[PDB]
Design a protein around this nucleic acid. Structure first.
Ligand code: MG
Ligand code: MG
Ligand code: MG
Ligand code: MG
Ligand code: MG
Ligand code: MG
Ligand code: MG
Ligand code: MG
Ligand code: MG
Ligand code: MG
Ligand code: MG
Ligand code: MG
Ligand code: MG
Ligand code: MG
Ligand code: MG
Lengths: 207, 259, 157, 98
RNA sequence: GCGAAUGGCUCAUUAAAACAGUUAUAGUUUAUUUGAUAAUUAAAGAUUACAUGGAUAACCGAGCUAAUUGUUGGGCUAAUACAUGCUUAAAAUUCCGUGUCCUGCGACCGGAACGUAUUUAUUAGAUAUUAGACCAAUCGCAGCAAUGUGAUUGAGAUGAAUCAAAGUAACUGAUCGGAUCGAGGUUUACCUCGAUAAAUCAUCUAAGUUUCUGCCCUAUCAGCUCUCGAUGGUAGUGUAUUGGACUACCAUGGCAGUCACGGGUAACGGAGAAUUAGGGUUCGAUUCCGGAGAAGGAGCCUGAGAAACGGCUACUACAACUACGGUUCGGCAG
């Protein structure tokens, strides 16, 4: 009965505070649920594991214990595909969560560019594989291929950081979902303000 | 507390039921329905102590359980010892084709008004909330916990509708604005009926309202307690105890024993 | 680089625009969360053109204000964006038919927008519990001068 | 034969699984043997006899898999007229063809 | 399948704690009720929907123990139990094909996605408090173009929303979308009124937590809280949700003679009770309400709902039976 009643505290004026009530059941406090990753099945066969907990109203709440694949969205483009997350880096909350590759709502991680690479290719005619072969278009320029241009000319100035990411195969993104609460793990792809920044934490972190 | 209450005490059951103090110890507890606990009249009360058609407790048990159906609430059959008949309702006693209004006194006691097959058709509804829901559709809701689909758009949240029960049709509504007639569903002033004077909103969380009536008395109550009994002076239903207006203990005496 | 990192590990907004804004390369991109609690309260000029990321603000967050609204003098400036206001009222004494003085202390949250100072009158609103004590946010600040002891100062404000 | 079940000199039955030649005491939840319900979670500290057979065993039930040349009276002499014939539409036809 | 978490007894604990009078829930859960709402069953699979599949009580029969609403073990058949599952709308929108025409990512053509909910990212929701003007560009209304026109229709709700309703992208698929049940009619094609299961929104009911104000003696109680939380900030956990409620990192605060902190109380708080010129004095275990508890204490199953306690687990102290192996539906503050 790990409770959370604010009684076992000390009122403003730090004087101990009285109790007449045994711990009451609605102050429930469930066992924490650290969330790891299977981006290393060196031991861990069963890729992802999610256990459902019977919550109050009568509903179920799925709890993420072990995972390997989540869903992520590229802010800029409005694209979202399910991908395989790689390694967790910098958890902010604490560095131990990174050491155990645990999944906090706001844990910054890596993903496979594959789905985004695949897409950025189909909609713009730009693979993002090593720079030289850059574009891959059609043979004749009379029909609908005229659009991959129109979009491509949209000065798709995807930050020098977004570019490097793709080619390296790794992609930076933060999460936005309580695994211990919904069982999933969804995140947005890192960019501008935070990208530049979180990276800094990483550059200086190792150096 | 253990869980959720489930009974009710003679002593604790509302003064609106004009109940028997010596009576027993309990009292039929209203069933979760269209009207709130305090603002309601469970059938058992309605027939036994009210109409007096029933009497002993088992008397009811017959009436509402008998395969004949003797009680109707707003054009529907009811067989629950304590269905919470609320304000502005219409109850019909099958076996006699009796039609009643569930309305409060001027002294705040639940009164039964006898209606003609005519009014028994329309029932007055007050508007709870108003917002648009699923697939671009408009919904209105009445105190009577009525949920309305595609309602006339010229209806603001604090409105009052006239309902044709027979066709489950609306007709002639009327919001609350300076210059209308109203009934107060609850308060130190319930059972009164007058002309709305003005509505001063204070937003800080509680707007108020003023009123006048027959002897031109000044009334004060919170909006939530105003029910628009009609638009521009003409009331829409026959009121109990003559007109919705109470007398000084002094006026009662002079009217009755003429002092 | 300052308002963003400054120790803490990130500071976005409720309306996660940012980096995506680079999509609307012509109009105004520098959006920040804008709001208006209303209730007869002006929204601070400073609140709008600020770089501050205070989730506990009543103009920069989905923090509501409801019911109880307060006016009280300020006691301390310490604490991170939190202040203690002291209210001074009289209490009646049934028997002797007179009053005594009394003071309740209140934990108030202060969005960066308005600038504090010790010993000034402040206006708090009723916002959801933000912490053990906090349950009030500042909405309107009036600067005032008290030459010295804030404790000595007792005004039926 | 198949060792069908166990009973101790004290009426204590066996529990497939609890592999221990003796009696252990456990908390039983629904879905267990030697445990009856009555209000979900009737969890009980009931004591039961192991899975491993021992000299402490008083009665062992057996299930005849393959009988031999030999003949036992009580066994081969029987011809039980099971009373309940199919009752679900589908089970009915399954017996008569159709 | 519901109920057993109502009631009933008691006051030991309990002095801003509980309580009361007030307020909040834009920080939440609510089985039963009342009103309303659903054209699309997801992919792979599989496929009957005039409708699927497998097993088990009761029963038959064998048995154990000294013992209890103990229970082994073999054979038999039904469900609203369990398990699995069939169901063509169009338009629109979005995207794709090196498809035509044309250049507007425009038009026609063809292909794909498309309920609801879940989980995120993003677009727009035009604070109808808030008037207008000129040139350019885009935009939309006529539109082959020319030239225009027009800036209009618009805007559910609140004091206020990162509200309601909605567009795009994808995720889970353990959300839902009835393989059930009556009765009364009637020359057919069936017809009429009901039961019940169950999703979401309301609604009722109740519950958490919450704002403010108010308590008896006492300093032979003056400094208290802070090694782990004491006060605030950050991020996460966790919960029904808020919150240091718990974790990590950071700041050092928070309370006090307008009596903190600590101690006593034959102190559960009110509604009220006894005497009363007025003002007071003394009580409130005790029919209403709220709280707490069931031998002391902690833990939990189950459920919409209790740390329940006329349910369970272990410990401390006990109560009942014994063939001393073991057992108890063992807790009268009903
Ligand atoms: Mg439910
Ligand atoms: Mg009932
Ligand atoms: Mg309000
Ligand atoms: Mg002075
Ligand atoms: Mg039963
Ligand atoms: Mg208090
Ligand atoms: Mg069998
Ligand atoms: Mg098409
Ligand atoms: Mg028939
Ligand atoms: Mg938080
Ligand atoms: Mg004390
Ligand atoms: Mg007392
Ligand atoms: Mg009581
Ligand atoms: Mg309460
Ligand atoms: Mg007794």
């Amino acid at each position: 009965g790990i409770s959370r009643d604010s009684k076992h505290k000390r009122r403003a004026t730090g004087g101990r505070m009285p109790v007449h009530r045994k711990k009451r059941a609605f102050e429930k406090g469930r066992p924490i649920s650290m969330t790891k990753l299977t981006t290393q099945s060196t031991t861990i066969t069963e890729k992802r594991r999610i256990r459902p907990v019977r919550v109050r109203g009568g509903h179920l709440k799925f709890r993420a214990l072990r995972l390997c694949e989540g869903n992520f969205s590229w802010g800029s483009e409005n694209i979202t595909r399910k991908t395989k997350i790689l390694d967790v880096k910098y958890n902010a909350t604490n560095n131990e969560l990174v050491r155990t590759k645990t999944l906090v709502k706001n844990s910054i991680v890596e993903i496979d560019s594959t789905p985004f690479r695949e897409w950025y290719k189909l909609h713009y005619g730009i693979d993002l594989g090593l720079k030289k072969d850059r574009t891959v278009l059609g043979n004749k320029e009379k029909s609908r291929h005229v659009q991959k241009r129109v979009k491509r000319t949209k000065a798709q100035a995807l930050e020098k950081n977004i570019e490097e990411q793709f080619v390296s195969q790794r992609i930076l993104a933060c999460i936005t979902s309580r695994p211990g609460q919904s069982g999933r793990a969804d995140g947005y792809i890192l960019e501008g303000k935070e990208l530049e920044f979180y990276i800094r934490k990483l550059q200086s972190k190792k150096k | 507390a253990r869980g959720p209450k489930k009974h009710l005490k003679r002593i604790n059951a509302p003064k609106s039921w004009m109940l028997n103090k010596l009576g027993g110890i309990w009292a039929t507890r209203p069933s979760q329905g269209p009207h709130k606990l305090r603002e309601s009249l469970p059938l058992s009360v309605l027939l036994k102590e009210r109409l007096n058609y029933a009497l002993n407790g088992r008397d009811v048990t017959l009436i509402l359980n008998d395969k004949e159906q003797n009680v109707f609430v707003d054009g529907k059959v009811r067989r629950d010892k304590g269905y919470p008949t609320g304000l502005m309702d219409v109850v019909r006693i099958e076996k006699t084709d009796q039609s009643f209004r569930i309305l409060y006194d001027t002294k705040g006691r639940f009164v039964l008004k006898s209606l003609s097959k005519e009014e028994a058709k329309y029932k007055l509804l007050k508007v709870t909330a108003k917002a648009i829901g699923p697939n671009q559709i408009p919904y209105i809701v009445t105190h009577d916990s009525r949920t309305i689909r595609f309602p006339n758009p010229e209806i603001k949240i604090g409105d009052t509708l006239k309902y044709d029960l027979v066709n489950n049709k609306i007709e002639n509504f009327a919001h609350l604005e300076s210059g209308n007639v109203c009934y107060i569903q609850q308060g130190n002033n319930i059972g009164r009926v007058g002309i709305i004077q003005h509505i001063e909103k204070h937003q800080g969380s509680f707007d108020i309202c003023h009123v006048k009536d027959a002897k031109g008395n000044a009334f004060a109550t919170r909006l939530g307690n105003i029910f628009v009994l009609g638009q521009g002076k003409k009331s829409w239903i026959e009121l109990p105890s003559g007109d919705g207006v109470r007398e000084t203990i002094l006026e009662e005496r002079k009217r009755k024993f003429s002092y | 680089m300052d308002t963003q990192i400054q120790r803490a590990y990130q500071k976005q907004d409720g309306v996660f625009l940012n980096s995506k804004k680079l999509l609307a390369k012509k109009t105004s991109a520098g959006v920040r969360y804008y709001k208006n609690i209303g209730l007869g309260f002006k929204t601070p000029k400073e609140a709008i053109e600020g770089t501050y990321v205070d989730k506990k603000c009543p103009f920069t967050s989905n923090l509501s204000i409801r019911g109880k609204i307060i006016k009280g003098l300020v006691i301390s400036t310490k604490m991170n964006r939190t202040v203690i206001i002291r209210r001074d009222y009289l209490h009646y004494v049934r028997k002797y038919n007179r009053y005594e003085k009394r003071h309740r202390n209140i934990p108030v949250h202060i969005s960066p927008c308005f600038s504090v100072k010790e010993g000034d009158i402040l206006v708090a609103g009723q916002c959801r519990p933000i912490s053990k004590t906090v349950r009030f946010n500042a909405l309107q600040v009036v600067p005032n001068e008290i030459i010295g002891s804030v404790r000595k100062q007792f005004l039926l404000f | 034969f198949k060792i069908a079940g166990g009973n101790d000199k004290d009426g204590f039955p066996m529990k497939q699984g609890v592999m221990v030649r003796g009696r252990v005491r456990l908390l039983l939840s629904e879905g267990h043997s030697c445990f009856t319900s009555r209000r979900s979670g009737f969890r009980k500290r009931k004591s039961v006899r192991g899975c491993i057979v021992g000299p402490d065993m008083r009665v062992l039930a057996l299930q005849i898999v393959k009988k031999g040349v030999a003949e036992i009276d009580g066994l081969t002499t029987v011809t039980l007229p099971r009373k309940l014939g199919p009752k679900r539409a589908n089970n009915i036809k399954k017996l008569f063809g159709l």
